[PDB]
Amino acid sequence: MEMEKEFEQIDKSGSWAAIYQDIRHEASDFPSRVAKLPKNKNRNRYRDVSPFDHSRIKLHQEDNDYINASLIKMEEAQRSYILTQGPLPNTVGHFWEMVWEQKSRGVVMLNRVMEKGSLKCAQYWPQKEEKEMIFEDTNLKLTLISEDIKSYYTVRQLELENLTTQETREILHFHYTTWPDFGVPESPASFLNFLFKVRESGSLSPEHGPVVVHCSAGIGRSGTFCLADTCLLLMDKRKDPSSVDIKKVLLEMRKFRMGLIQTADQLRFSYLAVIEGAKFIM
Ligand SMILES: Cc1cc(=O)oc2c(CN(C)C)c(O)ccc12
Numbered sequence: 001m002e003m004e005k006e007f008e009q010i011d012k013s014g015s016w017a018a019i020y021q022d023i024r025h026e027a028s029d030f031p032s033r034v035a036k037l038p039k040n041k042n043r044n045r046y047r048d049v050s051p052f053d054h055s056r057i058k059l060h061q062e063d064n065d066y067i068n069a070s071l072i073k074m075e076e077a078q079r080s081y082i083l084t085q086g087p088l089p090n091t092v093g094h095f096w097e098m099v100w101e102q103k104s105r106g107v108v109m110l111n112r113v114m115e116k117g118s119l120k121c122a123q124y125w126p127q128k129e130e131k132e133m134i135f136e137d138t139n140l141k142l143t144l145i146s147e148d149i150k151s152y153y154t155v156r157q158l159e160l161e162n163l164t165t166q167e168t169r170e171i172l173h174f175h176y177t178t179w180p181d182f183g184v185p186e187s188p189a190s191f192l193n194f195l196f197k198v199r200e201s202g203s204l205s206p207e208h209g210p211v212v213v214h215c216s217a218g219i220g221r222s223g224t225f226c227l228a229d230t231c232l233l234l235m236d237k238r239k240d241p242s243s244v245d246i247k248k249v250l251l252e253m254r255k256f257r258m259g260l261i262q263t264a265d266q267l268r269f270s271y272l273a274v275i276e277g278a279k280f281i282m
Pocket of ligand 1: 060
């Protein structure tokens with residue numbers, strides 16, 4: 001079926017939970033043996049969210065190459081994304097090592113450091129220009145260059161230096177700051193505006209390594225971001241845009257990381273975002 005009318009048909013019939021459970025039943029199951037080794041317990045935020053072995057990002061290190069991060073490679077859309085958990089106190093250096101090694105331009109953050117009165121990820125970037133951060137375990141230096149605070153999101157320019165080689169690179173930090181503590185946003189308008197700002201920066205383009213996107217577990221809000229982006233790109237590429245099937249795209253993405261889209265409300269919000277976004281594109 002088309003999307004907008006499939007949408008109203010699920011609303012009128014109140015069957016979002018049944019649709020979402022079907023997705024959960026059909027989703028791929030691949031091994032994640034490296035994630036579960038005992039030496040990696042303090043590298044995982046949640047025991048039930050792990051990267052598959054076949055698609056995990058490897059750190060360029062011989063001691064321990066493990067990080068909780070996955071490469072989502074979308075062949076028809078010609079887009080790639082790295083989806084990862086919010087960094088932990090003992091993985092902030094690994095996080096920036098990955099950004100460096102994978103040649104990423106942009107980092108997309110969809111959570112606040114504290115939500116619901118608890119810490120959802122480490123404070124992993126500097127907040128003042130004159131107070132830079134040094135990650136001694138991976139030999140990197142990170143400096144805040146500029147910050148632009150808007151009503152729904154903040155964009156930061158950061159400098160990442162590899163202290164071994166003295167090479168430097170400019171990284172863009174795109175921080176969506178207004179996702180509610182509970183539920184999903186009422187309108188997709190600010191989320192779509194944010195997606196378009198990431199696109200306009202070059203961070204999603206083939207001349208750079210894959211964008212790094214995270215929330216707390218790296219599957220819920222993060223899944224909504226890449227699902228909406230890929231569906232809108234396919235609607236631009238194909239002769240028949242009504243052929244784009246958001247459930248099929250989501251199942252393809254779940255071949256590369258488990259659990260993408262965590263609730264039926266997130267599924268409905270993803271439909272809403274693609275529907276409204278397709279009208280603005282034209
Ligand atoms: C992919 C890759 C390229 C590279 O330059 O080096 C690697 C190393 C070691 N060097 C010193 C970083 C690894 O241990 C693991 C992977 C790589």
